[PDB]
Amino acid sequence: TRSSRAGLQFPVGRVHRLLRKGNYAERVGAGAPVYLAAVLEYLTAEILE
DNA sequence: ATACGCGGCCGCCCATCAGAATCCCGGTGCCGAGGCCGCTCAATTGGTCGTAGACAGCTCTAGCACCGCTTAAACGCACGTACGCGCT
């Protein structure tokens, strides 16, 4: 389930919703919620340490 | 009248009993992961429809290349002036 299937530490089923409610393009590409959680986690980790 | 005795005082080394101080073991407070949890409202699940957008065909602009006549602009150097910058 999202983190699982994706294999990330970030919420994949949270940024998908905001990107569709922000109202960016007409519909949303399937690519992004998942990809978009990934880089975010990556940045998150780069600072903490 | 005249000579002997001594008396506590005292420096001396020498003895006894308490207090100061270092080491052998310590309790205490603060910070940060943990656990617990629970009412719940946002994500997920299973599902339909339709429409963007991938994709293949097509044609039809414009970006490339290439050349040579013409010449304005760059080049390099020579000479000195009037600033950069150092000192006071």
Q: What is the DSSP string of A1-49?
A: -THHHHT-SS-HHHHHHHHHHTT-SSS--TTHHHHHHHHHHHHHHHHH-
Following CA atoms A24, A26, A5, A46 in sequence, which dihedral angle do they give, to the nearest 10 degrees? Answer: -20
Resolution (A): 10.0
Rounded Cα distance, A34 and A10, in Å: 9
Reference A19, options A46, A44, A40; nearest CA is: A40
Angle value at C-alpha A10, between A5 and A12, nearest 5 degrees = 55
**φ, ψ of residue A44 in degrees (nearest 5):** -60, -40
A26 touches strand B (CB under 7 A): yes
Q: Is the CB of A2 under 7 A from strand B?
A: yes
CA of A16 to C1' of B68 (A): 62
How many C-beta atoms surround the C-beta of residue A37 within 10 A? 22
